[PDB]
Design a protein around this ligand. Structure first.
Ligand SMILES: *[C@@H]1O[C@H](CO)[C@@H](O[C@@H]2O[C@H](CO)[C@@H](O[C@@H]3O[C@H](CO)[C@@H](O)[C@H](O[C@H]4O[C@H](CO)[C@@H](O)[C@H](O)[C@@H]4O)[C@@H]3O)[C@H](O)[C@H]2NC(C)=O)[C@H](O)[C@H]1NC(C)=O
Ligand SMILES: *[C@@H]1O[C@H](CO)[C@@H](O[C@@H]2O[C@H](CO)[C@@H](O)[C@H](O)[C@H]2NC(C)=O)[C@H](O)[C@H]1NC(C)=O
Ligand SMILES: *[C@@H]1O[C@H](CO)[C@@H](O[C@@H]2O[C@H](CO)[C@@H](O)[C@H](O)[C@H]2NC(C)=O)[C@H](O)[C@H]1NC(C)=O
Ligand SMILES: *[C@@H]1O[C@H](CO)[C@@H](O)[C@H](O)[C@H]1NC(C)=O
Ligand SMILES: *[C@@H]1O[C@H](CO)[C@@H](O)[C@H](O)[C@H]1NC(C)=O
Lengths: 49, 272, 124
């Protein structure tokens, strides 16, 4: 029996979504978002790794 | 030869036509049979009274394969119930692609003409990939790959491993394996239910897809403080059984645990 | 319409909520507002920076009474101090019972979302 040893290196996929709303239902498709300091931000990081 | 010839778009030369009188003595040069009559001229002595002629003719022997050069055949003529009663000189030459060119001469007397069988119009060569030459063997076109693809040992075998996020897959260009001596391969994981399959992206490949999980195909996950590796074993053989030259591909690719994100949308504050 | 609509249960949509940045650029179709936020939406231009939105909207005019059919209204957008500075098109229709439906269309620009006043959950 002959044994060959090879391999690789892969990266998991992880993102963020700028959730327009609290409770994190809808992400953001834009590129420039303009708020006032008093407004809250609702974000997170998701994992399709 | 292959570039200097005349065509004959005639549907009446087929071996299905009822009967006729026309005889060929004005046929002079190299010809490319094209149309519903046929692309190749007959291989067996067709029964008498066919091909729009009382005494149809045929080529004895077989059509040459690809890459042979000039070949000489003696076309026979069937008449009076005795196959190959009259004889003529013909010169058959294959060509790059699915056609032939013939040195068509005048038979000794009238009432002699050539036929065309349906031949292998169904058989095509586009099914051969771009790296597969349009070769032929005994008149049947096959896909012989690059002769340059010649590797003797097995250590030099090419392994296309990309470690995708969801799963890892090991690919093998089937040209190198067919040059290695396996007309058909059998990629067996730790569980043989994980048999490989063919796929084409830039050339011919056969590949095994192993999910990047612990156990789904007997996959062994081994995670240390830094990374996490999936280690399994693959098995190759040209047949169902193995008697010598055991093949074991112990591939393992590892994913990270510390890793980063930044948002793709600019944000702008405004305050009084 | 009254049978073909999508339920919306959001407690943050109320005019009472502090502020956010929602813009309903994807809300397609007819919607039935439910929850503590309210079943009917805001009838007046709520003061700016509310309803989890920098610039929330309001339906100008009144809700249609029962047996009114398809009613076309234009949703006004209070922003920068000018109530109804931007406009949208809505189609509010009465429904059997104490609830309504709306034809909510995407705002021309983001930071534009709807509200729901407490309305008349008391009115039974
Ligand atoms: C925890 O486990 C992880 C994952 O298994 C491990 O990371 C590994 O570190 C070792 C030790 O350095 C690497 O070993 C490889 O060995 C050979 C040569 O000995 C080569 O394949 C590698 O060098 C290559 O590095 C680059 C890779 O493209 C290139 O510059 C070039 O190909 C080089 O030849 C390397 O030395 C092994 O690769 C990593 N695993 C990876 C990167 O996936 C880690 O060390 C472990 N931690 C412990 C045990 O504490
Ligand atoms: C087919 O090929 C032959 C040989 O290349 C061509 O020439 C004939 O060659 C033989 C042998 O030397 C001569 O005896 C004949 O006289 C040649 N034939 C002619 C017609 O000149 C031949 O011409 C080719 N036939 C056709 C029909 O193209
Ligand atoms: C609300 O009602 C309108 C009117 O039936 C729906 O259809 C729109 O009608 C106008 C006028 O013809 C068209 O210009 C629009 O393109 C139509 N919209 C669509 C999406 O086809 C409208 O769809 C309804 N809106 C909602 C949100 O339910
Ligand atoms: C033509 O080929 C056939 C088939 O093999 C053979 O019987 C015949 O003898 C051949 N003709 C000559 C003149 O040899
Ligand atoms: C919406 O209604 C309000 C209140 O009656 C009114 O001030 C405003 O002009 C209306 N908008 C349009 C576009 O007519």
């Amino acid at each position: 029996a002959l044994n060959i040893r090879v391999g690789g290196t892969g990266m998991f996929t992880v993102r963020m979504a700028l959730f327009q709303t609290p409770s994190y239902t809808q992400p953001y498709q834009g590129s420039s978002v303009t708020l006032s300091t008093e407004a809250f931000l609702y974000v997170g990081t998701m994992l399709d790794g | 030869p292959c570039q200097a010839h005349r065509t004959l778009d005639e549907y009446w030369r087929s071996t299905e036509y009822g009967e006729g009188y026309a005889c060929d003595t004005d046929l002079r040069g190299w010809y490319r049979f094209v149309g519903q009559g046929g692309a190749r001229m007959a291989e067996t002595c067709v029964p008498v009274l066919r091909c729009n002629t009382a005494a149809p003719m045929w080529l004895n022997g077989t059509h040459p394969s690809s890459d042979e050069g000039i070949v000489s055949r003696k076309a026979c003529a069937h008449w009076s119930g005795h196959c190959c009663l009259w004889d003529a000189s013909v010169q058959v030459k294959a060509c790059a692609g699915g056609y032939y060119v013939y040195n068509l001469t005048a038979p000794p007397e009238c009432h002699l003409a050539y036929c065309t069988d349906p031949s292998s119009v169904e058989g095509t060569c586009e099914e051969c990939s771009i790296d597969e030459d349009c070769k032929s063997n005994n008149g049947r076109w096959h896909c012989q790959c690059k002769q340059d693809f010649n590797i003797t040992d097995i250590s030099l075998l090419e392994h296309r491993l990309e470690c995708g996020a969801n799963d890892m897959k090991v690919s093998l260009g089937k040209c190198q394996l067919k040059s290695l001596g396996f007309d058909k391969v059998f990629m067996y994981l730790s569980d043989s239910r994980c048999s490989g399959f063919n796929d084409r992206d830039n050339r011919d490949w056969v590949s095994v897809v192993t999910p990047a999980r612990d156990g789904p195909c007997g996959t062994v996950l081994t995670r240390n403080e830094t990374h996490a590796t999936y280690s399994n074993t693959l098995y190759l053989a040209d047949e169902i059984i193995i008697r010598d030259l055991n093949i074991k591909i112990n591939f393992a690719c590892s994913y990270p645990l510390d890793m980063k994100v930044s948002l793709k949308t600019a944000l702008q504050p405004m305050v009084s």
